[PDB]
Amino acid sequence: MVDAFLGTWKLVDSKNFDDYMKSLGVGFATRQVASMTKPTTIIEKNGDILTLKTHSTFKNTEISFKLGVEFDETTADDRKVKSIVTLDGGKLVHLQKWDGQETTLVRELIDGKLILTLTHGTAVCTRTYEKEA
């Protein structure tokens, strides 16, 4: 069900990421570096367990999870959140909850590109990833 998401992906477009980061309270110097960074995202499975790596010259993260099972996560901007990832309409939907706040990280495949939509508050960011061979 998740298999078309698997592989190595590189950032090739970003819209409103500064808005999203600012909404989360990320400081200006971090936003400045992140606005110029192009991460590589690696999505792998082993049975029921997905691992999602995000690599860059600035921040690195890695999470492992089972779809539909809550997990603790510490985000790239150091939020300690309760997370769940599911498939919904063919999209990989990652919901993070902390302190009564929520953010969603929604991934969908359009014409072979991975579109990541990040929503927090009113901020909506769209980042496009292309597959590496």
Residues that bind ligand 11A (CB under 6 A): 11, 21, 26, 30, 34, 39, 41, 54, 59, 75-77, 116, 127
Q: Which is nearer to ligand 11A, 54 or 119 (CB)?
A: 54
Q: Which two tokens stand for residue 15?
A: 């819209």
Helix (H, G, I), strand (E, B) or coil at 89: coil
Minimum CB distance to ligand 11A, residue 82 (Å): 15
99: left (phi over 0), alpha (psi -120 to 50) or beta: left
Closer residue to ligand 11A, CB minimum distance, 56 or 67: 56
Min dist. Cβ of residue 106 to ligand 11A (A): 12
Cβ atoms of 34 and 58 closer than 8 Å: yes
Annotated binding site for hexadecanoate: 127-129
Report the distance separating Cα 95 and Cα 61, nearest Å. Answer: 16
Q: How far is the CB of 65 from ligand 11A (least distance, A)?
A: 15
Kindly state the tokens that stand for 133: 């061979």
Three-state DSSP class for 18? helix
